[PDB]
Amino acid sequence: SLQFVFACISYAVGLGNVWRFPYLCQMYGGGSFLVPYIIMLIVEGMPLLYLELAVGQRMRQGSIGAWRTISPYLSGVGVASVVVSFFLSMYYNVINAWAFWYLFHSFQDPLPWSVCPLNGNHTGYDEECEKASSTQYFWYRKTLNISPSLQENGGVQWEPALCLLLAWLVVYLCILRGTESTGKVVYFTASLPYCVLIIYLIRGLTLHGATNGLMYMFTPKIEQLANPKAWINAATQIFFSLGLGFGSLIAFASYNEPSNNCQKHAIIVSLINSFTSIFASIVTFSIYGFKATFNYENCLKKVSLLLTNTFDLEDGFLTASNLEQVKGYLASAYPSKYSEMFPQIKNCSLESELDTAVQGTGLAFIVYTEAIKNMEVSQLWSVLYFFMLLMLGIGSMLGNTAAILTPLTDSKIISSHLPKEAISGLVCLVNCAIGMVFTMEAGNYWFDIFNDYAATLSLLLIVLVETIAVCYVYGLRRFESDLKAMTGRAVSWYWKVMWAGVSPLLIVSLFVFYLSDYILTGTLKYQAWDASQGQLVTKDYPAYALAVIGLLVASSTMCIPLAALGTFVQRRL
Amino acid sequence: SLQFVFACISYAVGLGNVWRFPYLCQMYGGGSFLVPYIIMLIVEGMPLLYLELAVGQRMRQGSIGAWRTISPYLSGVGVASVVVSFFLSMYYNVINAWAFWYLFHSFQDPLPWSVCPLNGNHTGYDEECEKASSTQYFWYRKTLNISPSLQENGGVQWEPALCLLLAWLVVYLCILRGTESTGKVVYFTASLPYCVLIIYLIRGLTLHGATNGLMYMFTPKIEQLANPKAWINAATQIFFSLGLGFGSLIAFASYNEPSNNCQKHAIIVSLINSFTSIFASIVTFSIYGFKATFNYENCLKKVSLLLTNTFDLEDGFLTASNLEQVKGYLASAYPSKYSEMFPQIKNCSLESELDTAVQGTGLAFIVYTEAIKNMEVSQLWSVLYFFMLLMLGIGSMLGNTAAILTPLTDSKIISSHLPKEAISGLVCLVNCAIGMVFTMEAGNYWFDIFNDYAATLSLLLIVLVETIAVCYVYGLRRFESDLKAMTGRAVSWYWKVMWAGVSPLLIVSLFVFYLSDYILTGTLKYQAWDASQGQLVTKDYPAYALAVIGLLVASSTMCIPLAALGTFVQRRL
Amino acid sequence: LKSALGDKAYEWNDNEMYLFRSSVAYAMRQYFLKVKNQMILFGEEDVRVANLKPRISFNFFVTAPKNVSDIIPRTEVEKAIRMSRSRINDAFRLNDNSLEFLGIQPTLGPPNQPPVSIWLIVFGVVMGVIVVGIVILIFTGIRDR
Amino acid sequence: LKSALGDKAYEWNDNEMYLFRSSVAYAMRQYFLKVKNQMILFGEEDVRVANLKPRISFNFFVTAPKNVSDIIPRTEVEKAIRMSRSRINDAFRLNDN
Ligand SMILES: CCCCCCCCCCCCCCCCCC(=O)OC[C@H](COP(=O)(O)O)OC(=O)CCCCCCCCCCCCCCCCC
Ligand SMILES: CCCCCCCCCCCCCCCCCC(=O)OC[C@H](COP(=O)(O)O)OC(=O)CCCCCCCCCCCCCCCCC
Ligand SMILES: CCCCCCCCCCCCCCCCCC(=O)OC[C@H](COP(=O)(O)O)OC(=O)CCCCCCCCCCCCCCCCC
Ligand SMILES: CCCCCCCCCCCCCCCCCC(=O)OC[C@H](COP(=O)(O)O)OC(=O)CCCCCCCCCCCCCCCCC
Ligand SMILES: CCCCCCCCCCCCCCCCCC(=O)OC[C@H](COP(=O)(O)O)OC(=O)CCCCCCCCCCCCCCCCC
Ligand SMILES: CCCCCCCCCCCCCCCCCC(=O)OC[C@H](COP(=O)(O)O)OC(=O)CCCCCCCCCCCCCCCCC
Ligand SMILES: *[C@@H]1O[C@H](CO)[C@@H](O[C@@H]2O[C@H](CO)[C@@H](O)[C@H](O)[C@H]2NC(C)=O)[C@H](O)[C@H]1NC(C)=O
Ligand SMILES: *[C@@H]1O[C@H](CO)[C@@H](O[C@@H]2O[C@H](CO)[C@@H](O)[C@H](O)[C@H]2NC(C)=O)[C@H](O)[C@H]1NC(C)=O
Ligand SMILES: *[C@@H]1O[C@H](CO)[C@@H](O[C@@H]2O[C@H](CO)[C@@H](O)[C@H](O)[C@H]2NC(C)=O)[C@H](O)[C@H]1NC(C)=O
Ligand SMILES: *[C@@H]1O[C@H](CO)[C@@H](O[C@@H]2O[C@H](CO)[C@@H](O)[C@H](O)[C@H]2NC(C)=O)[C@H](O)[C@H]1NC(C)=O
Ligand SMILES: *[C@@H]1O[C@H](CO)[C@@H](O)[C@H](O)[C@H]1NC(C)=O
Ligand SMILES: *[C@@H]1O[C@H](CO)[C@@H](O)[C@H](O)[C@H]1NC(C)=O
Ligand SMILES: *[C@@H]1O[C@H](CO)[C@@H](O)[C@H](O)[C@H]1NC(C)=O
Ligand SMILES: *[C@@H]1O[C@H](CO)[C@@H](O)[C@H](O)[C@H]1NC(C)=O
């Protein structure tokens, strides 16, 4: 029945699709991102997903017990996979905090991101609110109050702290009402995001200069397709969207799906996930192209007005087409007045503005809140879109917390003096308390640091070790015979070669390329805000900052060789 | 369960409640109408309704067969009761035609009843559209094109003819889909009118000068409470709203309700009917008072402006409170200029405008279409309200056609060569063809003539003869013993005296009072439009017009003494 | 002109300059009547115009009615134009960005309508409902377990 | 004034009459330039005003610039005012009623 398809849709659609994918796509060329995305999708989203579902269905055990039985060497992979989800949850909830804040600021008139404040002498608008737009300022200053560097930390604020607290409380309340939320309700929840995206696509396709965004998103230019930092971040974005490495899919199809097909399931999941991502990365980029072309026309109009007011020209003469003709003409009439005015003529082009308009980790927010002020009734659509994002957030949040609660409420050592609600609240409280780093003044930098490495590299390595283990330690022929005898169908040599050969070579090649291009350039530069100019400068990471960058991937991936040693000291006696 | 209550609500709410009741209430003093309405309600809406339901449940036969068995004298009461409904259906469908037309004219901008046309010299608006308002003109001229008298008939128009044809076709289609329309659908149909009335009450209570309409509607003045033409038309309005006389309620609770209570049923029906009538006669009168106070303020402003422009006065000096002071002051300054200007000073008062603002049989239309132009988005509410009125129309129409179809699809003489659909369509076509009198230029006058007498007097007499028969020809004691043995409950002496004594005396007294006040004044005057002045003048009925006035009640009530004679010639042999 | 009115703009002949000089004379009359309590009959010939350019641009100064050597100071003319700017704008269909008196800046438009943290109210109501559901759930799961 | 602007109306002193006479002079200049192809320097002293009443009311006629005996006909003044009425309205914030 259609219930299976709708449950699958609910499974797939998350936050890596409507929030993370556009931020990654804009950052790495746009056109030069889908090609690597589709490549990594077909080569590592079909085979490893199906392999993981198949193992979870075959062993019918938890995330840790399965790899415990496959070999005594490989027990710690479950511990690492659980630590990964633990790292995920904390910074993950901040995205729900932000949507909470934006939602609370939607019951006003006018909306605070639609106008700029006034200066002290009440003549014009604020100086910072003019360099940036009305929305970039509201994001970087009103809801974040970012510092111009990483060393100027400051102190914990009180508004984002409260929003994050409320987010943790509401996820607590949703988890206390049983570890189930669907049933006769999937038809509404799984459908609301697509309906709101259709609405916003209708709105954003009727904006002047929209085709520029789609052109920038689809058409690839072969100069950053040779960037290794694009391939790896495209593959691990897939790894992050499907849920690999988190040990959730293994434990899901373990006490479920007795003899149903795993191939059809994995294929539908991967297809709907990728489709959702590509369709959501278009409604954003139409509005992005609109913003870029608007800023470009503004550059042009400002320069034209300066030239008109300076010498003297009939208003409306120098518009946008004779600009170069008149620029040249004002070199044989009176260059004495022109030369000393040259350092003020702004040189603006559309490409340089499509490249850097709203780039950053708040792209979804700034862009979506930018297409609300240009709407008929703004508060309604703002409330609707932000409630949609909150639903997606609570969904992905409960789905991620399942992978950390269940491998804890089953061990018969810790479940003695602590009941279910108590330990759930304890984990929630520790997470809420550790997530207070991201409510400081330089908190967005720490959020960005915690996002990429901790969410990507560990899981990329763990799925690799999982595949190596299932292929060359348990026996490929043994497993295919087992699955034939269990399900009654033989897997094609297509998947048989994808499991063994292509993925475990591609992942290692992608890792060594990125590690080499890290070793041949040196230290890496992240970003900044530069409130005094209104653009993202690229300041360097401090030395103490690289410490946490190392420690994250270490403490989330070095749990394998310590399990392989604890299982070696116990095998001595 | 609540299904019974909602089915009862669907039973009660019709068109005599939202269309006919306000038109009658405004016409007869307003305040001096509810008092007679409630009196006649308590004295003739409880007892006769319960008696009719009880007889229909006791005999378990049709409308004609029951009175056939009660006595051979009384067979023709069913024929008369059927002829009444036949007379009803034809002019009844015109009300659905009009709502159809108004609905079709709701997909425009601006709506045609919201502005006036221009004159020939394009300087100002039309002359007729200014005397009347923008809505009275659109009703009397655009959708009706009424003639200034009854003798100027003219020829059948083609727009209202088409609307009436479409109405008959759609009622045909609704009747062809089985003689049942409810079931798991009552919760929506019975509720929509109530919801739309709440909406319009919310809108109409926030209009300047609304309390005047409610004051005029509720507060009675004892000078027209002595008008006999108010009591009779208030009692027979009840008779028309509950469905007495039409023989539909007898045939309804005949093959149904085995041993359930009839008292509770009749009480709920009467209460919800009267409650809906009184609640709907308030949303209209709030807007009516608004219209009246607006027209009064307009009179005052026009006179003030004339006085200002005439002599000379600072604009804004003579507003509405010093009007009498200044009127008197301009008699000791220069009466030489004042006297020759006196026949132009309009004398306007609020009472004389509340008495005659929108009076007529299109009151519901003109008033409701007047509170749409004063709304935020007009087309939406217009479409909603007119679709509501169309639902009510089709409902009452099918309910009235049931009483004419079923006593025809059962007689085993005519059902031989004509199947169900064929005879249904034949009656529908004959009705559509006879209802073409009401699409002429003087068609509204014929509609008004056919409405009152044919819908009221026959049924008022037929329920009287029904009660006399059931009380003094079948035996009161026999019937109460039968009902006690059948249902297991004794009726109180309350209803026992209401059946025998109070109603058969009150109806005859009310009839002789009205017939005397007809004989002591002479001929009666109906109304006219007087397009050249913009108010309803009261021209006389022509002599040939009284012919149909007589023939209607004759051919719909004189079927009793011919049955009493046909049953006398057969009892000779 | 083209910036303000689009393809609906009139052309600027010397009758428009006549009307501008009359508007400035009216503004001076009003300022000297309502502030200095004097009645001075400025005319259109007391507004001296110079440097007329085709991008619509000029300088002007004002002289006492019949004493050509008496120049009203620039500060009093600035005050007189501030007092009547919204009327000179209307006479030409310009909107304070299309009619610039260089050196005189408009300083209005303060926003005011919030009585507090309108967002704090919804935050508080949601937090109340959430904590209430929380205690209900803890009580249920405790006494039933 | 009170009908159009409400409790926001200015008061009508003689500077307002000066501005009205200048507006009428401008309208006459424009009509004689754009229709008759002549350039005539009408001034505010060529618009003669009479019968000033407190309900705002007067009569006016127009005279050639320096020939006091030369009265422009009523028809040409009506045309000149039709041509520029939407501008005289704007100068005073009035709306043709
Ligand atoms: C946020 C971080 C998340 C942390 C979540 C991790 C939770 C599990 C951590 C441990 C997983 C690593 C496996 C290491 C092997 C255990 C060591 C050992 O057996 O001691 C040898 C131990 C002897 O070691 P010795 O100290 O060297 O002599 O053998 C024993 O005699 C211990 C007696 C066993 C008592 C039974 C207790 C039953 C609970 C066990 C279940 C816990 C595993 C959870 C797996 C769920 C699948 C069903
Ligand atoms: C947004 C983030 C925050 C969200 C909210 C988080 C807040 C939730 C945190 C809740 C923490 C408390 C949970 C309450 C659970 C129910 C309370 C209850 O039923 O109490 C009954 C009751 C409470 O006291 P009462 O007032 O007398 O009812 O406690 C008892 O009377 C039972 C007797 C307790 C015996 C103590 C001995 C236990 C240990 C034995 C020796 C070993 C020591 C090791 C201890 C283990 C600790 C790790
Ligand atoms: C555009 C959105 C997606 C479009 C696709 C719509 C949905 C497709 C449904 C999938 C069809 C499968 C139905 C069930 C049958 C299972 C398939 C099966 O048996 O596989 C084993 C099948 C068995 O073959 P054997 O080697 O003979 O055993 O393996 C194959 O040989 C098929 C190989 C096809 C490779 C995938 C298709 C594309 C590869 C070529 C390069 C693609 C360029 C990427 C650019 C895309 C741009 C958008
Ligand atoms: C829009 C107008 C609506 C019109 C709807 C009215 C439909 C019914 C009209 C007749 C009602 C008046 C009753 C008059 C008594 C009938 C005359 C008579 O019996 O002839 C004597 C007749 C002798 O009369 P003679 O001509 O004087 O000798 O007796 C017979 O021998 C006739 C043989 C009877 C044949 C059986 C036919 C079965 C159909 C009868 C059913 C019709 C009544 C419908 C009632 C429904 C309740 C179940
Ligand atoms: C909006 C207002 C208008 C709404 C729409 C109203 C229009 C509906 C009116 C419909 C009128 C016709 C209904 C059609 C019914 C089905 C047609 C059909 O099945 O025909 C098969 C068929 C039609 O011809 P076909 O083309 O050969 O199929 O007719 C036959 O072949 C059957 C043979 C008929 C025998 C004739 C003898 C019957 C009478 C015997 C002597 C007595 C004479 C008295 C006649 C009684 C008349 C009162
Ligand atoms: C405001 C909207 C309506 C308000 C009423 C709300 C609903 C009322 C539910 C009806 C109560 C009956 C429940 C079931 C019992 C059946 C009654 C029963 O047994 O009757 C036989 C009952 C048996 O009595 P017996 O004579 O001892 O056998 O008859 C009576 O004695 C009751 C007589 C009461 C008359 C009706 C009430 C009003 C009469 C006084 C004048 C009214 C002024 C009208 C102005 C109204 C202004 C709005
Ligand atoms: C806009 O473009 C012009 C020309 O492409 C730039 O002017 C050039 O500046 C370089 C130095 O940076 C000179 O060597 C060239 O001779 C200049 N060109 C000309 C034609 O004079 C200009 O710098 C650009 N705008 C900005 C803001 O840099
Ligand atoms: C308005 O009211 C006035 C006074 O109430 C009416 O004038 C009276 O007219 C009658 C004749 O119809 C005279 O006999 C009275 O002397 C008049 N009264 C005064 C005070 O002069 C006037 O007719 C009313 N308006 C209209 C239109 O009839
Ligand atoms: C014209 O205006 C000038 C000022 O601009 C007047 O000049 C003043 O004249 C008095 C004596 O007449 C001197 O004491 C002042 O010092 C003069 N002022 C300046 C600034 O020079 C002049 O009087 C005015 N003439 C008329 C006829 O009013
Ligand atoms: C002033 O205008 C009048 C017209 O209003 C002129 O009068 C005309 O004068 C010529 C000869 O000078 C006569 O032939 C015409 O018959 C006169 N017209 C009228 C209507 O009387 C007068 O010439 C003008 N004066 C100046 C100095 O221009
Ligand atoms: C604008 O404000 C600054 C201080 O914020 C002040 O120094 C300056 O004088 C103001 N501008 C004017 C024209 O007064
Ligand atoms: C641009 O300037 C040229 C003169 O160099 C002129 O001929 C042309 O009409 C101008 N274009 C527009 C659109 O005004
Ligand atoms: C108004 O129209 C009528 C004819 O409808 C015409 O006789 C009259 O002259 C017009 N008014 C004017 C001022 O021309
Ligand atoms: C009405 O006129 C009187 C003079 O008779 C005046 O005193 C009063 O202020 C006027 N009322 C209003 C509201 O203007």
Numbering used by the authors:
A (entry chain B), B (entry chain D): 11 to 583
C (entry chain A): 624 to 768
D (entry chain C): 624 to 720
What does the paper say about this structure?
Angiotensin-converting enzyme 2 (ACE2) is the critical cellular receptor for SARS-CoV-2, directly binding with the receptor binding domain (RBD) of spike glycoprotein (S protein). The CLD of ACE2 is reported as the chaperone for membrane trafficking of amino acid transporter B0AT1 (SLC6A19) and SIT1 (SLC6A20). Here, we report the cryo-EM structures of the full-length human ACE2 bound to the RBD of the SARS-CoV-2 Omicron subvariants BA.2 and BA.4/BA.5 (hereafter referred to as BA.5) at an overall resolution of 3.1 Å and 3.2 Å in the presence of SIT1, respectively. From an overall view, the RBD binds to the ACE2–SIT1 complex with a ratio of 2:2:2.
The Omicron BA.2 subvariant has quickly outcompeted the BA.1 subvariant since Feb of 20223. To reveal the interaction details between ACE2–SIT1 and the SARS-CoV-2 Omicron variants, the RBD from SARS-CoV-2 BA.2 and BA.5 subvariants, respectively, was mixed with ACE2–SIT1 complex at a stoichiometric ratio of ~2.4:1 for 30 min and applied to SEC to remove excess RBD. The cryo-EM structures of Omicron BA.2/5 bound with ACE2–SIT1 complex were determined at an overall resolution of 3.1 Å and 3.2 Å, respectively. The interfaces between RBD and ACE2 were further improved to 3.0 Å and 3.1 Å, respectively, with the focused refinement, supporting reliable modelling and interface analysis. Each PD binds to one RBD. The interface between RBD and ACE2-PD for BA.2 and BA.5 is almost consistent except that Arg493 of BA.2 forms a new salt bridge with Glu35 of ACE2, whereas Wildtype (WT) and BA.5 retain Gln493. Taken together, these mutations of Omicron subvariants remodeled the interaction net between RBD and ACE2. ACE2 interacts with SIT1 extensively via the extracellular region and the membrane region. On the extracellular side, the remarkably extended TM7 and nearby segments of SIT1 are connected to the neck domain of ACE2. When compared to dDAT and other LeuT-fold transporters, TM7 of SIT1 or B0AT1 is particularly long with its C-terminus extruding out of the membrane and connected with ACE2. These structure-based analyses indicate that ACE2–SIT1 complex are tightly coupled through the connection between TM7 of SIT1 and the neck domain of ACE2, and the π–π interaction net on the membrane region.
